[PDB]
Design a protein around this nucleic acid. Structure first.
Length: 1137
DNA sequence: AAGATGAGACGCTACAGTACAA
RNA sequence: CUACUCUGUUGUUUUAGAGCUAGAAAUAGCAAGUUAAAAUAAGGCUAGUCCGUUAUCAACUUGAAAAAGUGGCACCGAGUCGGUGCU
DNA sequence: TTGTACTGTAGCGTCTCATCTT
């Protein structure tokens, strides 16, 4: 007999169903492996796999880069100690040794407890002389006297370890670091983008306004007041507030559907900016970048407040002044609270839990929380005018290591490091010998294009070596082949075109790409001028003319400029209405105007044989963000132009990639027409042809050749094909599990294949699913070259299946039980066969109209549907990530080997990888005798490697003895057990279970509950609504029988009898409620019965506190069930042994 | 009438903590 | 529409920064507080300025591993699958 | 000594909704 398969693909589930030609589902007798007596069972061939959503690589990449950063910083410290080592050993033998073991408690610290000097007296003198590191730093910059080599090392190591940012490249100069120059660049960019309505911001004194020691909103209002034409809630006002560090809302400027709630200080700023630019386009990206640069300058001015130039170290002197302010205001607050409000003195300065100063220094209170707490207190006192104004300025009692330090460039630390290396240069000869070496330790940065410095073992690295020497910051210029590593970087980072997988995607700012966008916008353009009767798209001569006069002249072409500067100017048209476009084009020749601004030679850009050159420079500036490699790749065009245009062109950067490849836009050519895509866009293209049209064209040769290219190369083996596919990894998990359930269903059906497999995806991706099945499913060949397609593969829309449900009263209810995925799988199987047998269009359902509707109603009414919860070994972090203080608890996990956690504190809440059933012996508590024992042991992700190497030694280290090795069973999460009377429990961890059963509530109750749920919103005809509503009111005895279904089901498999007493009482108190209201409270009620974790739910008077099943002992003698991915094949292990 | 801030509660759900029971 | 490369700032934990006056302590009065080190998944061997939280994983048999195999069909019922005939 | 019911605690941070200011 022949059979067909239907599927329901989801982000958390795969529905699957087997159908006969007669539209019945088969039910078959299955063999059981394992030691139980129940050798054979009956199952229906319909069910659904359930699993957790697939996680992204994002978190893993963050932790990976953090690990790399930590390793590299520790290596920098190692390099500095290696330089200092010999002379340090001449000065102090155990200095670095005392430094590395500073963490350990004194009882197992081998050296003296005092890190720097080793004696208490010199430590007291040091801490009194320099209460902060910045006092030492300013001394070491501004003193010519000889200093101790230890303090030299502390200053240099503090600079190198915390070295500041590299966003400014080259030397620190006012063109890229002062507030006035980047304010001028911001307003020049703003006037360049908004050519109409510019701002005459050149009259403003930006340094006096933005660098003023004034409250930040009041500073914003000061800058707005100097600019009469624009306001605070204008766009420019919002970028100024954003650059100051407020949280403006660009929704007011771009009329977006959602808040553009940007703020630079938040860690997730960048993502919010990409979501904003995904809406408003990429024209504005560099504008927000300029605002970010201005913010870096502003906040740097708020740190480096010592502009008096008497010192050589501005940062050190600024932090010393900040400490002095903190000390003075600390004394003044102590005095003022002591004399005016004595009742709160101990609350502020001693109670470190309660958000005061003691909470702000000794506790966990942030600066924002401290200002939240202390500001109302300051308003209640005398003399606090000086202090509250500093709080308004955010300048009161400031710490030195704060969030604002992220704007400090590495050139500032480099300058202070250079000052100390110069001041003590003659006193210590090895600083004179190793000045450039230490400076290179600070200044060296691994480029983007080099990647990790692996020796071939890493998955992520690509660089190529000129020598097998170990890489250091000093030999990097000669060990890594920078050219070859750069070439490998280009090879790896180039995305392939989804439409043409052999070809690389063009850069986003490619000139060819910009022409494609402009001509695509303009073939869609159509217009009526006053001299003609009916609209037409612009001709190719017209298209060329508008591009030449307008798009090659202005960065933002708009319909007004069309009408005045082309149609009246050239075509002599009195008036034109251009129906086919927006008021202003989003597409632009932006990069052309950029390069025209840089190199100032329009004829060089119009000269067509230069096109390879400009595409190469645009590709270079898009790929690389390191100035040296940009110089290297631009060497080949130093002869085309030279001096200022080169020096300025080297500074330009671009971001992102286009949608399409060169071979697609202006490569492939129609055999009939002799035109490319770009030719059809640029010419008339018959009457009209958009890019999308050109692609989805039946006449054009493109549609067949692009498919013939798309099936090639991308048709890899299964897993690597899934990795290449487009989508978030949850749907990738779904598709791969889909392929596996198809493989096991064709495994189970006598190795006979189906004839139809039907897909629904809850999109382009579904065609690749069909291709995956097409290439997996057919491998035979006949004599000639043609392929054979022996199974039909069909795609169904969800909307039509939903209409099938609602028309014939096959109403889905998604939350009574998990059978629905299998039920839509059966439904699109039915329609997928029906469609292809009717038409080798839904109206012929309104096929045997008597028998087949009864058959599908019977199939939906069936209570045995194969739910399979995918058992998964858990992966992720070892525990919750916070580090907790010392305690007398055995539960804490140590952070290193030697660090006994009761001394040092550690992590908590570890995550179990899988549980293991162990049969062994254990010492009886009141004796030493070995009692035989059987139990579940939890294996956390940390211990997984040690157990999975050698189980026996791990179990004996856990304390077990005489372990029966063959009896140990790997039990992942959601391992399934069957308890008494058909009760089922799933293993969530070694200490907790979850309920497994589902209430297969009969279809009459499902239809009743659906119609009662939507009782006022059925949306049918009034006859249809009346007929539906009269069903509920004549079966209203159901809202007792539904309660006495859940009562019986709970009394059988949900042992929470105290809760059942509560709700049945709560039901009886509230039986009087209206029909829909009680019906949705029963919809809420099935949470007690539902598969998964026990979870709270709401009823009329009370929320029912769920009974957690917090003990796993009752499964240790049950029938453990191993289930195949379809759940059809099983292995049942009776643990009563 | 629109944006900022402030925080009740939605509670994911498994695993400390404690008292408690044989 | 995934994926990847670089870097910075915080936060957390333990120690160092001698607390001082009373009192047998318990506990009160007074002062003091801004920083530094080290760690930031335990760790691993290929000893790399690398890797370690993504994807993948029912069981059994054979294999170090990638991986191959392992489970009769109708009929009739449907409280999570059961019953009957053939084999 | 030894297996139980109850809080609240994380990685929190939205889902929710109310008032003050412009």
């Amino acid at each position: 007999k022949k059979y067909s398969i239907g599927l329901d693909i989801g982000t958390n589930s795969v529905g699957w169903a087997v159908i006969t030609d007669e539209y019945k589902v088969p039910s078959k007798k299955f063999k059981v492996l394992g030691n139980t007596d129940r050798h054979s069972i009956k199952k229906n061939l319909i069910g659904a796999l359930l699993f957790d959503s697939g996680e992204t690589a994002e978190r893993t990449r963050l932790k990976r880069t953090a690990r790399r950063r930590y390793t590299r910083r520790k290596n920098r410290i190692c390099y500095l100690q290696e330089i200092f080592s010999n002379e340090m050993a001449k000065v102090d033998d155990s200095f670095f040794h005392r430094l590395e073991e500073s963490f350990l408690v004194e009882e197992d610290k081998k050296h003296e407890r005092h890190p720097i000097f080793g004696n208490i007296v010199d430590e007291v003198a040091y801490h009194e002389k320099y209460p902060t590191i910045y006092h030492l730093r300013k001394k070491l910059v501004d003193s010519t006297d000889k200093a101790d080599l230890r303090l030299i090392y502390l200053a240099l190591a503090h600079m190198i370890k915390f070295r500041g940012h590299f966003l400014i490249e080259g030397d620190l100069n006012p063109d890229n670091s002062d507030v006035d120059k980047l304010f001028i660049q911001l307003v020049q960019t703003y006037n360049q983008l908004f050519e109409e309505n510019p701002i005459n911001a050149s009259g403003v004194d930006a340094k006096a306004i933005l660098s003023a020691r004034l409250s930040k909103s009041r500073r914003l209002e000061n800058l707005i007041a100097q600019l009469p034409g624009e306001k605070k809630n204008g766009l420019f006002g919002n970028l100024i507030a954003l650059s100051l560090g407020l949280t403006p809302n660009f929704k007011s400027n771009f009329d977006l559907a959602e808040d553009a709630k940007l703020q630079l200080s938040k860690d997730t700023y960048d993502d919010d900016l990409d979501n904003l630019l995904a809406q408003i386009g990429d024209q504005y990206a560099d504008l927000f970048l300029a605002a970010k640069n201005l913010s870096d300058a502003i906040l740097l001015s708020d740190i480096l407040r010592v502009n008096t130039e008497i010192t050589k170290a501005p940062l050190s002197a600024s932090m010393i002044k900040r400490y002095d302010e903190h000390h003075q205001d600390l004394t003044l607050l102590k005095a003022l609270v002591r004399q005016q409000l004595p009742e709160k003195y101990k609350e502020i300065f001693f109670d470190q839990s309660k958000n005061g100063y003691a909470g702000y220094i000794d506790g966990g209170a942030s600066q924002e929380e401290f200002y939240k707490f202390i500001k109302p207190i300051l308003e209640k006192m005398d003399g606090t005018e000086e202090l509250l104004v500093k709080l308004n300025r955010e300048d009161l009692l400031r710490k030195q290591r704060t969030f604002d330090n992220g704007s400090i460039p590495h050139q500032i630390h480099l300058g202070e490091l250079h000052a100390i290396l110069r001041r003590q240069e003659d006193f210590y000869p090895f600083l004179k010998d190793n000045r450039e070496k230490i400076e290179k330790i600070l200044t060296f940065r691994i480029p983007y294009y080099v990647g990790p410095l692996a020796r071939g073992n890493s998955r992520f690295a690509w660089m190529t070596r000129k020598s097998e020497e170990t890489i250091t910051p000093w030999n990097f210029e000669e060990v890594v082949d920078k050219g070859a590593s750069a070439q490998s970087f280009i090879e790896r980072m180039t995305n392939f075109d989804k439409n043409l997988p052999n070809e690389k995607v063009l850069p986003k700012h490619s000139l060819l790409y910009e022409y494609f966008t402009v001509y695509n916008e303009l073939t869609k353009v159509k217009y009526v001028t006053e001299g003609m009767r009916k609209p037409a798209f612009l001709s190719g001569e017209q298209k060329k003319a508008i591009v030449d006069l307008l798009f090659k002249t202005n960065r933002k072409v708009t319909v007004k400029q069309l009408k005045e500067d082309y149609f009246k100017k050239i075509e002599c048209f009195d008036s034109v209405e251009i129906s086919g476009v927006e008021d202003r084009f989003n597409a632009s020749l932006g990069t052309y105007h950029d390069l025209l601004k840089i190199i100032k030679d329009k004829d060089f850009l119009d000269n067509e044989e230069n096109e390879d050159i400009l595409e190469d420079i645009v590709l270079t500036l898009t790929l690389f963000e390191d100035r040296e490699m940009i110089e290297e790749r631009l060497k080949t065009y130093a002869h085309l132009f030279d001096d200022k245009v080169m020096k300025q062109l080297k500074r330009r950067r671009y971001t992102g990639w286009g949608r399409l490849s060169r071979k697609l836009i202006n490569g492939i050519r129609d055999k009939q027409s002799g035109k490319t895509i770009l030719d059809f866009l640029k010419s008339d293209g018959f009457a009209n042809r958009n890019f999308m049209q050109l692609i989805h064209d039946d006449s054009l040769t493109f549609k067949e050749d692009i498919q013939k290219a798309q099936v090639s190369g991308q048709g890899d083996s299964l897993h690597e094909h899934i990795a290449n596919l487009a989508g978030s990894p949850a749907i990738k998990k779904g598709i791969l599990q889909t392929v596996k359930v198809v493989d096991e269903l064709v495994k189970v059906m006598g190795r006979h294949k189906p004839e139809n497999i039907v897909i629904e995806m809850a999109r382009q991706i579904t065609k690749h699913v069909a291709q995956i099945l097409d290439s997996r499913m057919n491998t035979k060949y006949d004599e000639n070259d043609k392929l054979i397609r022996e199974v039909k593969v069909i795609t169904l829309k969800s909307k039509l299946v939903s209409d099938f449900r609602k028309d014939f009263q096959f109403y889905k209810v998604r939350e009574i039980n998990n059978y629905h995925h299998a039920h839509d799988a059966y439904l699109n199987a039915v329609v997928g066969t029906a469609l292809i047998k009717k038409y080798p269009i839904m109206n012929f359902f309104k096929w045997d109209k008597g028998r087949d509707f009864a058959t599908v109603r019977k199939v939906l009414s069936m209570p045995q549907v194969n739910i399979v919860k995918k058992t998964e070994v858990q992966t992720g972090g070892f525990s919750k990530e916070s580090i907790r203080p010392k305690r007398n608890s055995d539960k804490l996990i140590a952070r290193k080997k030697d660090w006994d956690p009761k001394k040092y504190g550690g992590f908590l809440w570890p995550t179990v990888a899988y549980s293991v059933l162990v049969v062994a012996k254990v010492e009886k508590g009141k004796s030493k005798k070995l009692k035989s024992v059987k139990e579940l042991l939890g294996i956390t992700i940390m211990e997984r490697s040690s157990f999975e190497k050698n189980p026996i030694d791990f179990l004996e280290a856990k304390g077990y003895k005489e372990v029966k090795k063959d009896l140990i069973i790997k039990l992942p999460k959601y391992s399934l057990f069957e308890l008494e009377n058909g009760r089922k429990r799933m293993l969530a961890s070694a200490k907790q279970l979850q309920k497994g059963n589902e209430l297969a509530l009969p279809s009459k109750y499902v239809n009743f509950l659906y119609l009662a749920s939507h009782y006022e919103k059925l949306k049918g005809s009034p006859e249809d609504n009346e007929q539906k509503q009269l069903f509920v009111e004549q079966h209203k005895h159901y809202l007792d029988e539904i309660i006495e279904q859940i009562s019986e089901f709970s009394k059988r498999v949900i042992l929470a009898d105290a809760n059942l007493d509560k709700v049945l009482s709560a039901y009886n108190k509230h039986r009087d409620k209206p029909i829909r209201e009680q019906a949705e409270n029963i919809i809420h009620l099935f949470t007690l019965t539902r598969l998964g974790a026990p979870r709270a739910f709401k009823y009329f008077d009370t929320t029912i506190d769920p009974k957690q099943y917090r003990s796993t002992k009752e499964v240790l003698d049950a029938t453990l069930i191993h289930q195949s991915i379809t759940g059809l094949y099983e292995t049942r292990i009776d643990l009563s042994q």
